């Protein structure tokens, strides 16, 4: 909230996991409505703004995608708006759908959180060409992740 950094040494390479807690809590469930809503209260906390404007705080070692569960809020769609979904649609809107951790959850999140298509517009397809261009992963990307990074540029 305020003394967000209670970490050290990439999470003694103990911080880590308790960051990884807090996004594991957030993925839980989320958004939409009584139960929803209070997951949306929990998400205003959040600020998913707050979280995307945010990493300052420590310095993990693969604790970095502790907030990659916003995209649960997409049911009962109206009701997760009316708790606030845009108060993180700036940058953790520009994550989810972003190119067509971070790699594989452009293609998922992009067919699984109802967002908008994401020239002057054109860098998430861009993204998603680099990600199938890499070969050091055991086959993250093949032909066909290169083709849906095509797609999600075009989008």
């Known amino acids: 909230?305020?003394?967000?950094?209670?970490?050290l040494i990439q999470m003694m390479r103990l911080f880590m996991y308790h960051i990884h807690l807090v996004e594991l809590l957030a993925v839980c469930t989320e958004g939409k409505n009584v139960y929803t809503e209070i997951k949306c209260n929990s998400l205003l906390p959040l600020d998913?703004?707050?979280?995307?404007?945010?990493?300052?705080?420590?310095?993990?070692?693969?604790?970095?995608?502790?907030?990659?569960?916003?995209?649960?809020?997409?049911?009962?769609?109206?009701?997760?708006?009316?708790?606030?979904?845009?108060?993180?649609?700036?940058?953790?809107?520009?994550?989810?759908?972003?190119?067509?951790?971070?790699?594989?959850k452009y293609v998922t999140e992009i067919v699984m959180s109802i967002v908008t298509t994401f020239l002057q517009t054109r860098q998430p397809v861009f993204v998603q060409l680099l990600?199938?261009?890499?070969?050091?992963?055991?086959?993250?990307?093949?032909?066909?992740?290169?083709?849906?990074?095509?797609?999600?540029?075009?989008?």
Request: glycine share 2%.
């Open 48 to 104: 998913d703004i707050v979280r995307v404007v945010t990493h300052e705080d420590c310095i993990p070692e693969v604790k970095i995608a502790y907030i990659n569960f916003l995209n649960h809020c997409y049911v009962d769609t109206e009701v997760e708006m009316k708790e606030i979904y845009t108060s993180n649609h700036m940058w953790k809107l520009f994550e989810n759908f972003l190119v067509d951790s971070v790699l594989e």
């Open 1 to 7: 909230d305020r003394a967000s950094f209670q970490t």
């Open 131 to 155: 990600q199938g261009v890499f070969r050091v992963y055991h086959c993250n990307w093949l032909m066909p992740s290169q083709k849906a990074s095509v797609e999600s540029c075009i989008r």
